Enzyme design. Sequence first.
Site, mmCIF file in Angstrom:
data_model
loop_
_atom_site.group_PDB
_atom_site.id
_atom_site.type_symbol
_atom_site.label_atom_id
_atom_site.label_comp_id
_atom_site.label_asym_id
_atom_site.label_seq_id
_atom_site.Cartn_x
_atom_site.Cartn_y
_atom_site.Cartn_z
ATOM 1 N N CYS A 85 0.690 -1.158 0.000
ATOM 2 C CA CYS A 85 0.110 -0.082 -0.053
ATOM 3 C C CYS A 85 0.848 1.546 -0.109
ATOM 4 O O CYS A 85 0.179 2.328 -0.294
ATOM 5 C CB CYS A 85 -0.915 -0.084 1.158
ATOM 6 N N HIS A 130 -3.272 7.603 1.704
ATOM 7 C CA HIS A 130 -3.737 6.175 1.227
ATOM 8 C C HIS A 130 -4.947 5.882 2.116
ATOM 9 O O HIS A 130 -5.199 6.268 3.394
ATOM 10 C CB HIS A 130 -2.690 5.143 1.864
ATOM 11 N N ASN A 167 -10.172 0.461 -0.190
ATOM 12 C CA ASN A 167 -8.641 0.359 0.032
ATOM 13 C C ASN A 167 -8.163 -0.415 -1.286
ATOM 14 O O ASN A 167 -8.115 -1.472 -1.157
ATOM 15 C CB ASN A 167 -8.364 -0.076 1.408
#
Lengths: 322, 323
Positions: free
Chosen positions: A116, A249, A279
């Site tokens: 990520c 993020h 996500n």
Amino acid sequence: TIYSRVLGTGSYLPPNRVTNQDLAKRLAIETSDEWIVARTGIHARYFAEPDVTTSDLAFIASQRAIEAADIDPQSIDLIIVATSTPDFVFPSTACLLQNKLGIRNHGAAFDVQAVCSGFAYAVATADSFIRSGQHRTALVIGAETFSRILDFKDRTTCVLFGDGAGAVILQASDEPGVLASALHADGSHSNILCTPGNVNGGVVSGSAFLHMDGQAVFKLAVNVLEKVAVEALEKANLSAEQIDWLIPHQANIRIMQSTCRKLGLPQERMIVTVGEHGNTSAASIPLALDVAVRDGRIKRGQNVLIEGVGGGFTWGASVIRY
Amino acid sequence: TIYSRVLGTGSYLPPNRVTNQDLAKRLAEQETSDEWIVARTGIHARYFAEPDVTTSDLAFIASQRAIEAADIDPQSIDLIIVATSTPDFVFPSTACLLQNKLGIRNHGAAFDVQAVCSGFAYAVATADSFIRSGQHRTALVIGAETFSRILDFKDRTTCVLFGDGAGAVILQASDEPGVLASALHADGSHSNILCTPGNVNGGVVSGSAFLHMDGQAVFKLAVNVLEKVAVEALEKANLSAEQIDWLIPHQANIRIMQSTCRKLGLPQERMIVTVGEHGNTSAASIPLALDVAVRDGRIKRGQNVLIEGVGGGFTWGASVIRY
């Protein structure tokens, strides 16, 4: 005296919008729209058909960046893709993307793995190549088909991640966009967020499904995100008050609100897409970047802070004057 | 002003040395021979990891040996880049696992790069760029593979060709050049001729998680680009092919290696050759050969080294390094 300026942005979500209700019914394992929103701030996410790969998503996001940049595709001399769900064991997604775009200039193309935090890693790498004079125009991608590594018997994680792709074209400039970046890793925390398997002799060994200790990830997350933002801001000779937009993020609303508050920024200065995107790991930040550029929130001359954490543990941040 | 100098080298092969006869006997329970393999490839042995031993396991030992040679504090390594196409896990990265195995607690950046058999050139060039700018100071740069995990042992074209292993360098900021220049390239239009065309999806493998190759097309492409990228890299370092003291190609097969070397106009004795004993260990190839030749005293301080290879992608790249 060479800097990397953002010429254009682009993004793409696959067509199957999967609502919280869609997902709760699917499992029906027990969950609900209320439970997912309370936990995560997510209402929807997007899943690729299992037939559609990360480079497919990457291709469309790139096309759109190329259009915004208004450049000849043949002038892109570097492609870096951040992904943890590449089409193939090899070759790289970047190489497939190069060919899909019909780029014939033999420019360098590779993938980087920081999960990520992948896009921060990819941005910082491209920036380094452009600043030195070695490359001139880079296509930088975050792209995932994280639905391929989700266990749908695990409500902890399978309601959390989505698919998608985002892209930015960076070009040598006498004036700064990318001011500074800070990247970090701590492999002692690899066990708390991992997809602990891979292919071996034709079959999967280990588990090729994402597993996560949400509580440990959260505490670690808030702990490092504050520090790296400050380090990056110091490296760019800027203060928190000079940030016009924060793009974390998109992990979940509460980690995002925490970070923003700890920086002392008002919540209205933070781009939030997690509610609709979920996500999407490395895709997360450049999706949000694209949305906010194209809807007119992010304006030329403004200072943008991107930052995130991911599996590794990894984390990183960038300060970009758009 | 700031350059990347090689402080130390290290490498590792897993313990199971698999001879051509060992492998021929194996597939005879499935078709090939020692003679056929040597004639084709120049390979006599390669090394296979136990299936429960991973790329990061191999990487750990090679890194420790580099750290030892460098004679540095492990806590001073602030960057780890691993080139591999067989990482332990889908995620997190091999570099992250390696960090923890080495007990490095300084929170330095760690990531993997994918350029297959060109991976180490890609990794060196990325680290170099980070060190030159002042952003990082001491980098551990790894090529590591367990390619036995993606071999089809019913395919004699490819399953006699690839091996496992790891190699490592430590690079550090220096006022004097080691790394003079790098040139990296890719052409995705040739992805189909060298590929492991699958991955995991919903718990199972989709596509094929086995390496396939059109040897004839790979060879012709290889020889074609290797000559050019060597020259480009040598020009970018302000040198010529006659100033090379040692050539270290990716150890693919003896005939691509000899071709390249001849086309540079070098004598064959100026090329480090390990393919015979190591086989083709993809990204691990070049730093294995680097370590062998540094530690047996061939490669001496001040000498110019050219590393060059091609791989899946298609990718290729080179680096010119004053040791």
